[PDB]
């Protein structure tokens, strides 16, 4: 005789993305993967303005939340997703911001063909023995057949060959943001 | 009325004229007067056009500046238009006053551009001040009893002083109910001299209640930010607690013994909403309407302080087992909804879990016994989430465990998995299910090639078993965690257990879109020791595909289904299946 | 006056204010709280230095003045003397300079901020725990006895004051310092008052009382399904019934009626 | 419409609850499916404009899924004559059925409740009437055997092809609100445990099962084959009502004899 | 020197008359008040000429938010 009142629920924690491009295939549209760029950008560029360094960012610390809400993470085969300047052993210090845009870079690369880099050879002493004494990177041929140009611009841009001429994150976000606006088809 | 206490402490002979010291309010909803009288210290004619003629000017921070260096002196207000809000429901305001060698005065003003003080005669009042107000026609409703009384406990109930009333109630009499405060702040005094039956007495006229407390905590700290605290907790839970919507009044916050604001979410979390306290303090920075605290993040700091001395209390009630069975019985859910959300404090909020455990008939353990009593090879705790205690209790999967010695953890609640989904690891320890794929158990080398030898004994009919049944389970393997019984179904590592399901699929006000992503596939699991396998072995060989055979897979993988915990979706064919078989049994041909 | 420029800065690790839409907290927590402590330990490592620094300087000092003293004897010493002057004359004023920026960074934490371990220093504390033995209950027939003499007469005082009128609100004050007070031989007494009362035949107070008695008596029955004493169960039931819905009040009508039909018959 | 709904539903669900003033022009715009359109949601309204002049009532049903209601042994006889029933699927749905209950000026009654009576002749009623003595012992003794797990089990009309079904009292939450209750977190069921799902017991005098159970328990009153066929009649109904076992091991280790008996391996 | 007077750049609608705006205006509106990619469903738009004076501007968003049925978020 005293009825009820329905009562929410808290949350509760979505997909990884290492799981979404490697064990199933969950193939979305052009401007899904635009928006997932775009957000992933935004928080990489909010927790740039406060001198925190994310020092790794994994695809499974990225978290596709409910509906689509990019979320990213620190919980923690992984040779392949540091700086080619990670690979020394000098002033125990090579990190700065530049390496954390090279592996939004990555990310964004495996985001726009879903593939794993470097699928050629598979061994990791030989890949290790090669990259810290070599300039070999992904070919960029593997792209998708209605990939923008601009994209692949921003790419070639993002990790070419030293700390230097790196760009900062704020650029990467408003171009970004000007491709989102002007993308019906291509 | 504390200015003329402290001034008295030099000479008795300020005191000649009046002794007692009292607060009164007389209405009177005839004149519609809200008189006040009371016997403080007195003003001067020069006083008097300084202090209530000048606006933004106190008298108060004079007096305190004034006074040598260090003193027993605590008063509230340094702001000065203080006053004035009188006239929210006010039309004529007077002010009757007298010193102790001056004579008596009158001041009357009307909220314009001036006032008008003059010498007067009428009732020799001894060295207070009377202060009447000439209420508004609109708000006539301060005359009453109820809304004087409500206003004078929410507000100032901590005053030190007899606040009094002379009510007419029923030859008509003059009351002189005094029951406005009668209850003596607590925290101020020492703690090494109350003794117990004090704090109940002064818990139950707090908050309302029929019974006393459990606990109490009253520590304090100093230095810039320094306060007093009187934390409880109580015997029983409201039937209300997780209500919410009301605002919640359990912890207050004073200065100078004076109520400025009530809430609890930020100054205790969500989970800890069932202990009452005060968190008197001394300064602050206040804002204009002392309504609000500027600079909002002192207010965090107290949280951290008031958590960590909670968690302190909880650990020492833990010292005598008679107790916490009590605390335990009411206050459980709290803890784990805390350890779901809380990152910082998380390791110590897992040593105050007990459970049932498969050694103990109906005494709770905890971890660090589990630990304690663990066999040289094992390692990792073995645990398993159900709907009920006794139907955990006899399982298939716990048969196998059970039967080498080793020990398993029981939860019935659906906050548990929870729990569970959050803390992964204690001690250096990891936890592990026994519902999923086949978690491996230390063993010796000729099971292990008993067991390599029947992976092919029964390679045929594991194979012969997918076709029959479409897209439903991924595949099918020989396990080892079953003595007495046929088959059983486990989840998958990446996605829902049974019970996780059950408990989603229940709820409320959640979406139905994200169902499909999540949830995860199961696994049939067949035991190659009971006859009835061994029977199907023998048709399956003997004949490739034969309608009993079929009729047989669909049952068994039904019934297995219903015992592993999940829910069947068309249990009308079940039923029409029972039938048939019921009426081959009994007689009637159709 | 009223100057509040101290507390105007304070830093907080775990602000639950201070989000982002593509930040889950919980790991950025953790990285406040990490970077405080570098920053913080690097502070500490450039003051011990400096401390340290002077401490040995002041040795030295010390030793020097000895050198001085005993040279004030002797000869001979002057280009290690002068060597001695020129290098402490320079590790003195960048000393000097050091502890200027000392000062300087003092300020500057009062710049990046306070925290929680620098405001406040623990004073006193003690605990309790109230091992009170729970389980006072006197026999069943002498506190029957007893509270019906006394109890029941003071109350039945009590209850003939509150019984003439019908407000709410007042008999929810009343029932509250009731179940302060009345126990179970209060209600009988009210239950045989309601007996003589129909005996009396008096319509308009039969019907206010009855009011009344039938809701304690629903009270009186809630209690014994919960077995819980109507001390401890009378807000929710009071709150249900100032809000009660327009069914629940046609069944509590049909109740009033089935009670008064009853008891005209008894 | 369409994808207004797909996406808001369950906010207008909320209104019939918590307010109270807007009840009556807020009923319209649910919508649910019937036992008519395969795929199309009609409406109250427009269902109102088809029932015939002798219904009086709206049938409804509050279950799990779909297809799970689209066969249950409830509607199996209000479906016969020609009437129609609505689908309620979701937990809201009886969240916001309790308080909704009256519309253009009619009640609803569902079809998982005691005592529903359908408006027909007396010849029927007269029939059940007689055959209302024939199964009079048999009550009795199922009363007896069950041993105070139900507290009625009479006749009523409900069945055609199904020997047994369960249902639960007039005043008490329903089977589908009993596991919602029972599943989700923060319960304080240190009060709700005690106090709700009042049952009875329902059969039909059409089946071969019962008579035959019939015609063996006239000659025979403290056979054994009598108590395990009431134990596994009740337990197989209760499972087929949306319920849950008390503990799954016992039927299923039924089962496994069962079938081992009918492969023959004996002992 | 740059000149980014994009500071504002979003006119306010609600003041103008119901009748002189098209849905391409509303739906850009809508586009630069919540950063969605997506336009709206339906639109609401009337004042209170009483002894009280307000006008409201009121949408409704295509696709529900994943968070709306939270316990203490800032909404
Ligand atoms: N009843 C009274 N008896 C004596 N002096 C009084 C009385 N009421 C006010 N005063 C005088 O009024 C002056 C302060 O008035 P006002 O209340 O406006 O300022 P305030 O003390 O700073 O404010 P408040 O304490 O209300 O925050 C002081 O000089 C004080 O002595």
Redesign the interface.
């Known amino acids: 005789t005293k009825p009820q009142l329905a009562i929410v629920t808290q949350w509760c924690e979505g997909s990884s993305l290492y799981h979404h491009l490697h064990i199933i295939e969950t193939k979305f549209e052009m401007i899904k993967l635009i928006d997932i760029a775009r957000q992933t950008a935004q928080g990489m560029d909010y927790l740039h303005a406060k001198s925190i360094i994310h020092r790794d960012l994994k695809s499974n610390n990225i978290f596709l939340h409910e509906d689509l809400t990019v979320k990213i993470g620190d919980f923690g085969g992984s040779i392949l997703w540091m700086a080619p300047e990670v690979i020394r052993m000098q002033d125990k210090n090579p990190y700065s911001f530049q390496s954390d845009v090279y592996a939004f870079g990555i990310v964004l690369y495996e985001l726009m063909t879903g593939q794993l880099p470097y699928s050629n050879i598979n061994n990791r002493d030989q890949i290790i023995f090669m990259v810290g004494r070599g300039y070999l990177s992904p070919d960029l041929s593997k792209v998708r057949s209605n990939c923008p140009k601009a994209m692949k611009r921003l790419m070639a841009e993002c990790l070419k060959k030293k700390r230097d001429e790196r760009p900062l994150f704020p650029q990467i976000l408003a171009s970004i943001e000007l491709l989102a606006r002007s993308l019906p088809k291509i | 009325l504390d200015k003329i206490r402290y001034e008295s402490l030099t000479d008795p002979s300020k005191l000649d004229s009046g002794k007692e010291l009292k607060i009164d309010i007389i209405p009177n909803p005839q004149e519609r007067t809200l008189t006040l009288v009371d016997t403080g210290i007195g003003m001067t004619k020069a006083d008097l056009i300084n202090n209530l003629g000048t606006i933004a000017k106190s008298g108060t921070k004079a007096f305190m500046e004034a006074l040598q260096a260090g003193a027993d002196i605590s008063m509230i207000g ?2 000065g238009v203080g006053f004035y809000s009188a006239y929210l429901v006010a039309e004529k305001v007077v002010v009757i006053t007298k010193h102790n060698d001056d004579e008596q005065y009158a001041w009357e003003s009307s909220a314009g551009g001036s006032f008008t003080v003059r010498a007067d005669h009428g009732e020799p009042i001894g060295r207070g001040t009377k202060v009447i107000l000439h209420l508004k026609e609109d708000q006539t409703e301060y005359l009453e009893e109820r809304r004087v009384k409500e206003v004078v406990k929410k507000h100032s109930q901590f005053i030190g002083y007899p606040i009094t009333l002379y009510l007419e109630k029923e030859k008509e009499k003059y009351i002189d109910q005094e029951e406005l405060n009668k209850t003596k702040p607590i925290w101020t005094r020492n ?1 090494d001299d109350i003794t ?1 039956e004090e ?2 007495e002064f818990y139950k006229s707090l908050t309302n209640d ?1 019974e ?15 306060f007093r605290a009187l934390l409880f907790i109580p015997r029983r ?1 409201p ?5 919410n919507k009301k605002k919640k009044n359990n912890i207050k916050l004073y200065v100078r013994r004076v109520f400025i604001m009530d809430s609890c ?1 930020e100054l205790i979390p ?1 989970y800890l909403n069932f202990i009452r306290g005060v968190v008197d303090s001394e300064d602050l ?1 206040l804002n204009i309407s002392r309504e609000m605290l ?2 909002s ?2 207010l ?2 107290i949280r ?2 008031i958590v960590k ?1 909670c968690l302190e ?1 909880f650990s ?2 833990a010292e ?1 087992k ?2 916490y069975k009590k605390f335990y019985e ?1 206050f459980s ?1 709290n803890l784990k909804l805390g350890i ?2 809380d ?2 404090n998380r390791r110590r909020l897992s040593e105050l879990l007990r459970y049932h455990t498969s050694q103990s008939g109906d005494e709770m353990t905890s971890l660090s016994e589990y630990v304690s009593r663990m066999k040289e090879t094992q390692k990792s705790i073995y645990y398993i989430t159900g ?2 205690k ?2 955990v209790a ?2 298939a999967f716990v048969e196998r465990v059970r039967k080498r010695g080793f020990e398993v953890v029981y939860m019935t609640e ?2 548990d998995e ?1 729990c569970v ?1 959050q803390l992964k690891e204690f001690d250096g320890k990891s936890l592990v299910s026994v519902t999923k794929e086949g978690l491996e158990l230390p063993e010796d080398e000729e099971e292990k090639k008993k067991m390599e030898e029947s992976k092919a004994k029964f390679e045929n009919l594991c194979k012969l078993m997918k076709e029959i049944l479409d897209k439903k389970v991924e595949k099918v393997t020989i396990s080892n965690r079953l003595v007495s ?2 088959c059983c179904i486990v989840t998958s590592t ?1 996605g829902w257990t049974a019970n996780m399901e ?2 989603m699929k ?6 139905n879109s ?1 169902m499909g ?2 949830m995860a596939k199961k696994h049939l699991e067949i035991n190659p020791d009971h ?2 396998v061994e ?1 199907l072995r023998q048709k399956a060989e003997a004949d490739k595909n034969d309608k009993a055979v079929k009729d ?1 897979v669909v ?2 993988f039904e ?1 297995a289904l ?2 592993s915990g999940f ?1 069947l ?4 064919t ?2 029409n299946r ?2 048939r ?3 081959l ?4 041909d159709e | 006056m009223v100057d509040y420029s101290v507390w105007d800065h304070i830093e907080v690790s775990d602000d639950e204010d201070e989000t982002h839409p593509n930040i889950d907290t919980a790991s950025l927590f953790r990285w406040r709280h990490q970077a405080r402590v570098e920053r913080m330990e690097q502070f500490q490592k450039e003051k011990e230095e400096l401390d340290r620094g002077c401490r040995e300087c002041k040795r030295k000092v010390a030793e020097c003045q000895r050198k001085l003293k005993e040279l004030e004897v002797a000869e001979g010493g002057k280009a290690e003397l002068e060597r001695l002057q020129a290098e402490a004359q320079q590790l003195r004023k960048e000393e000097r300079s050091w502890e200027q920026k000392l000062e300087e960074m003092r300020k500057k934490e009062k710049s990046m901020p306070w925290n929680v371990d620098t405001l406040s220093k623990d004073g006193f504390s003690k605990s309790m725990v109230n091992t009170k033995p729970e389980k006072t209950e006197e026999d069943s027939e002498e506190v029957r006895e007893q509270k019906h003499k006394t109890f029941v007469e003071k109350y039945e005082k009590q209850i003939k004051h509150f019984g003439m009128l019908r407000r709410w609100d007042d008999s929810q004050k009343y029932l509250s310092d009731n179940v302060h007070l009345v126990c179970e031989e209060t209600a009988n007494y009210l239950v045989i008052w309601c007996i003589d009362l129909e005996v009396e035949e008096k319509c308009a107070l039969m019907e206010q009382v009855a009011h009344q008695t039938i809701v304690m008596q629903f009270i009186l029955e809630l209690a014994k399904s919960l077995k819980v004493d109507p001390r401890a169960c009378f807000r929710q039931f009071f709150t249900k019934i100032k809000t009660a819905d327009r069914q629940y009040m046609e069944g509590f009508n049909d109740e009033l009626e089935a009670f008064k039909e009853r008891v005209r018959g008894r």
């Open positions: 340094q702001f703690p117990q704090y109940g029929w006393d407390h459990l606990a109490v905590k009253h520590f304090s700290v100093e230095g810039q930010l320094e839970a039937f209300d607690l997780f209500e979410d969500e920075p500027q600079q993040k002192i965090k700091v951290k302080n001395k209390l020492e009630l005598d008679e107790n009411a859910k779901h959300e990152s910082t709907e009920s006794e139907q006899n399982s659906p906050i929870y989904q019984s046929p990446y059950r408990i229940a709820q409320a006000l959640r979406d994200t992503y999540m006859p009835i029977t047989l049952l068994l019934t219903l015992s829910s979706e068309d249990p009308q079940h039923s029972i039938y078989m019921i009426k049994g009994l007689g009637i």
